[PDB]
């Protein structure tokens, strides 16, 4: 019965986990060589 | 006459059979170490320069340097610009950077009678000095190089004499007034002297270095806004002509200062565009006197816009109205 909605609230749940990661993957100071010398 | 002819023929023979190898078993990489073994210095270098390989060129140059008499080294290397260029540059880099083989440049530039390049070396020395007394001694040497020719080097020599003079007067200013002066340019000196109120000395600077009037005015105007001396700014306005106009006096005083003192330069402003006198009174915050000017030029549209700004009642407004 409701054993088809349970996947949807897990699908659309992890969907937002990735988008939250990517928007964090563009987080602050980008990796460079000079940044690692200071 | 003969003793040298044997050389002119022999070496012209060593070259004959040497060129009989740039054909078989070339190129560049292997052929300049070969030529350099056979005491064909001048050919090795030229071959290296043609190759474009900077590192190769160095190798023949470095070899020539310790092999040949230095006088002859300079001779050989100065025939070829690209070689002289690199010898010249390296004499500025043997550390690297900073440290200088000045002795090499001095000797090199003298042999080629390169006086500008030689004099320039001494100017570089004058900058490194801690005392202006020893700094002036370096400039003297620079000047002494240029005193021979004389023609063409007229400006440089004048410039040098100008610089020696400027340092001497600057050294004086420190003794008397207890402040930094040595090192500053002529223009920077007139500025600091005026900002500090020493109006008299500044004029002695202007006179000695033949400072262009239009420049002197621009320096004075800027240096007085610094001192905020609106009184002697006021005193300058009391004459007819200005070599820089009065619009500079307008805009420069208006910026960070009195809208009051600024507006008094209209209508001394000869070079102005029509109906700009109005907007100037506006920027000075004098809406009252602005409307009055709008009328004199018979531009009632400006009279309309200025009254609409106020509003027939506020800021009197009638006073704006009564002027029409």
């Amino acid at each position: 019965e409701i054993r088809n909605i349970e996947q949807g609230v897990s699908d659309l749940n992890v969907l937002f986990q990735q988008v939250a990661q990517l928007v964090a993957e563009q987080g602050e100071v980008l990796d460079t060589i000079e940044r690692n010398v200071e | 006459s003969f003793e040298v002819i044997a050389r002119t023929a022999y070496e012209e023979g060593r070259t004959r059979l040497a060129t009989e190898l740039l054909n078989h078993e070339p190129r560049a990489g292997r052929q300049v170490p070969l030529l350099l073994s056979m005491e064909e210095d001048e050919l090795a270098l030229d071959k290296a320069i043609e190759s474009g390989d900077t590192d190769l060129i160095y190798f023949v140059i470095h070899q020539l340097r310790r092999k040949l008499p230095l006088a002859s080294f300079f001779r050989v290397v100065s025939s070829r610009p690209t070689a002289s260029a690199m010898v010249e540059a390296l004499a500025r880099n043997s550390d690297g950077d900073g440290n200088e083989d000045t002795a090499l440049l001095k000797d090199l530039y003298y042999q080629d009678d390169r006086r500008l390049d030689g004099a320039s070396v001494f100017i570089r020395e004058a900058l490194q000095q801690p005392e202006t007394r020893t700094a002036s001694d370096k400039l003297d040497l620079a000047a002494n190089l240029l005193q021979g020719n004389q023609k063409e080097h007229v400006f440089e020599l004048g410039a040098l004499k100008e610089a020696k003079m400027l340092l001497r007067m600057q050294e004086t200013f420190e003794r008397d007034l207890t402040d930094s002066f040595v090192g500053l340019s002529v223009n920077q000196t007139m500025f600091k002297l005026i900002k500090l109120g020493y109006h008299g000395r500044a004029k002695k600077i202007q006179s000695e270095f033949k400072v262009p009037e239009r420049v002197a005015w621009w320096i004075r105007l800027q240096a007085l806004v610094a001192k905020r001396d609106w009184n002697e700014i006021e005193e300058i306005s009391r004459q007819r002509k200005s070599p820089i106009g009065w619009e500079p006096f307008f805009n420069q005083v208006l910026q960070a200062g009195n809208p009051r003192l600024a507006a008094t330069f209209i209508p001394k402003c000869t070079n102005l565009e029509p109906g700009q006198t109005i907007t100037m009174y506006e920027k000075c915050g004098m809406r009252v006197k602005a409307a009055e000017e709008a009328v004199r030029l018979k531009d009632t549209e400006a009279w309309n816009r200025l009254l609409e700004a106020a509003g027939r009642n506020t800021a009197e407004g009638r006073e704006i109205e009564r002027l029409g």
Binding site: D31 | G52, A159, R214
Partner: protein
């Protein structure tokens, strides 16, 4: 099967990493500062850690840590300074050490004889694992290759150092070795000819090698994926880099200064911004005239907000799943827009001041062909008002370069202005501008312009901008900048002489169209021989013996963002039949040029 800028990046990274493998175990890294930047274009510091790097150190910092045992050096090998610098550090760490340390040196791009001699005359040569890192072109974009030799302009035109020409030749030769001989080597200018001559000398040595059993299998034939290479010498057109650039990226370089696709700003000490073609917004903004940036900036803000609202319609998994899909791409675009709104804002303030407009006013008159004496009062004002020395000197050099010298009476005054204005040290500064032949008296043989009426004479006659202003339509006042119809948009009415020369090769029909009126061939300088003759240096077209091919436009001695944008403007017009790829020794501008000449010593305490 054609040329791809990505294969350059890949080779560069792979060549670097294969040398890091060679030193087994973990290692501490030491890099030449003005080499770290360019390296960041081919490799991540992330990737470097994976290959065993603990701490990073600039060579010019003199603080290499004794942490790890292996010490790896990466510096350009042609540099006299770098050789001494490393040797000095190998003694600072051999007489302050606690362990023996393994010392590795990766010379870019090669181990030089000089390098060894400096290392030898320090004893530390024996304790040195010396390898070669054949880095040449750093691919800054898919269509931009640069050697990233920052001091190449000073080196070449002031010091008369053939190193940049040598490297660039080798770099270009690398392209030939992979993709075949350039069918045509077309060029203009002295150093363009030197590059071409080295390309022919190196070719013969490859044929002398393969013939004499050095093998290498083969054996080079004309390319099938390359139309030609066009080489322009920077000393042919000093004017274009002297002018204040008016494109968005140009003005950014003019005010913020762009290095290695990056820059510094204060309000997003200060922070570092990345500036390259990845960011979809910057792509459209960079090559555009700064005027229409507002029009463009808003339009993108106008489209983003009504692209976030949209598509909550079909509230069925997908059309939201698809919305959340395009969600990180919105946020990025949103933060990009906020940055380039701030940046655009700062630049708008720079361009509104008096001094800027006074400068640009002078620039416009000189360019257009007004009598430079009319601009004398303006220049004098600018010196008197203590406007920055680089900008004043650029007006002076622009004056000299575009009018074939300065009148001898006006010249003596300008010199007085500079000396008294900024300090007598600049007796040297003016001497250097004289050596660069960018600031000469009209009574100097070197200052004369190429004329086909003024008899013969003159070995290094200068570019005649007076003749070329009309004959190559250097002025276009028509140009609309919302939808630019011609490269002259980059300077709001003035097309760079350099890129007009390229158009004499590539877009011949169009050029005649904007002059008098009304593939396969005809290639070369054909039909424009007399016009190009009035530009400095040798004109040449060496020949070495289907569908759209690539064309390399090479700048020896620096290129400007304006010239890059202009070239991109043409690349689009030619997108069908040609792929235009830009190469250069460095990326240059007016301030970098002046810095080559300006003496910084000071007569002070």
């Amino acid at each position: 099967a054609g040329f791809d800028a990505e294969q350059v990046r890949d080779k560069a990274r792979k060549d670097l990493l294969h040398l890091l493998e060679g030193v087994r175990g973990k290692k501490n890294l030491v890099i030449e500062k003005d080499l770290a930047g360019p390296l960041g274009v081919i490799v991540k510091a992330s990737t470097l850690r994976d290959y065993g790097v603990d701490n990073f150190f600039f060579l010019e910092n003199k603080n290499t840590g004794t942490s790890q045992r292996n010490i790896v050096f990466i510096a350009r090998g042609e540099s006299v300074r770098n050789a001494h610098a490393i040797a000095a550090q190998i003694k600072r760490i051999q007489r302050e050490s606690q362990t023996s340390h393994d010392f590795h040196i990766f010379w870019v791009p090669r181990r030089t004889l000089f390098s060894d001699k400096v290392l030898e005359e320090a004893g530390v040569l024996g304790d040195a694992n010396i390898s070669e890192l054949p880095l040449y072109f750093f691919p800054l974009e898919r269509d931009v290759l640069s050697l990233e030799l920052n001091d190449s302009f000073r080196d070449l035109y002031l010091a008369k150092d053939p190193t940049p020409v040598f490297l660039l030749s080798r770099a270009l030769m690398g392209i030939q070795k992979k993709h075949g001989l350039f069918p045509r080597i077309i060029g203009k200018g002295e150093n363009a000819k030197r590059v071409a001559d080295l390309l022919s000398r190196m070719r013969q040595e490859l044929l002398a090698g393969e013939e004499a059993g050095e093998s290498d299998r083969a054996g080079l034939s004309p390319s099938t994926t390359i139309e030609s290479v066009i080489i322009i010498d920077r000393e042919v057109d000093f004017v274009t880099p002297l002018l204040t650039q008016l494109t968005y990226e140009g003005l950014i370089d003019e005010y913020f200064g762009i290095q290695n696709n990056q820059t510094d700003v204060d309000a997003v000490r200060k922070r570092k911004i990345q500036l390259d073609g990845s960011d979809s917004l910057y792509s459209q903004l960079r090559d555009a005239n700064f005027a229409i940036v507002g029009s463009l900036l808003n339009t993108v803000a106008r489209r983003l907000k009504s692209d976030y609202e949209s598509r909550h319609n079909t509230k069925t998994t997908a059309e939201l799943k698809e919305f959340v899909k395009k969600l990180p791409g919105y946020q990025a675009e949103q933060q990009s827009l906020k940055i380039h709104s701030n940046i655009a804002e700062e630049i708008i303030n720079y361009t509104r001041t008096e001094i800027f407009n006074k400068l640009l006013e002078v620039q416009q008159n000189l360019a257009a062909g007004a009598d430079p004496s009319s601009q004398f009062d303006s220049i004098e004002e600018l010196v008197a008002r203590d406007t920055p020395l680089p900008q004043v000197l650029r007006l002076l050099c622009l004056y000299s370069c575009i009018s074939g010298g300065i009148k001898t009476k006006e010249l003596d005054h300008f010199r007085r202005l500079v000396l008294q204005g900024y300090g007598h040290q600049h007796l040297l500064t003016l001497h250097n501008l004289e050596r660069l032949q960018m600031f000469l008296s009209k009574s100097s043989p070197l200052a004369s312009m190429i004329t086909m009426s003024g008899s013969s004479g003159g070995p290094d006659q200068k570019t005649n901008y007076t003749y070329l202003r009309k004959q190559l339509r250097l002025i276009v006042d028509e140009v609309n900048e919302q939808d630019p119809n011609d490269i002259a948009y980059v300077y709001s009415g003035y097309a760079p002489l350099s890129i007009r020369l390229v158009q004499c090769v590539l877009q011949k029909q169009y050029l005649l169209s904007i002059t008098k009126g009304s593939g396969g061939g005809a290639q070369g300088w054909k039909g424009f021989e007399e016009i190009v003759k009035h530009a400095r240096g040798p004109t040449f077209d060496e020949i070495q013996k289907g569908d759209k091919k690539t064309v390399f436009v090479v700048f020896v001695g620096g290129i400007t963002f304006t010239e890059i944008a202009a070239l991109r403007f043409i690349a689009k017009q030619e997108e069908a039949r040609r792929n235009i790829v830009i190469c250069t020794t460095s990326i240059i501008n007016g301030n970098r040029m002046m810095n080559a000449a300006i003496e910084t010593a000071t007569f002070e305490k």
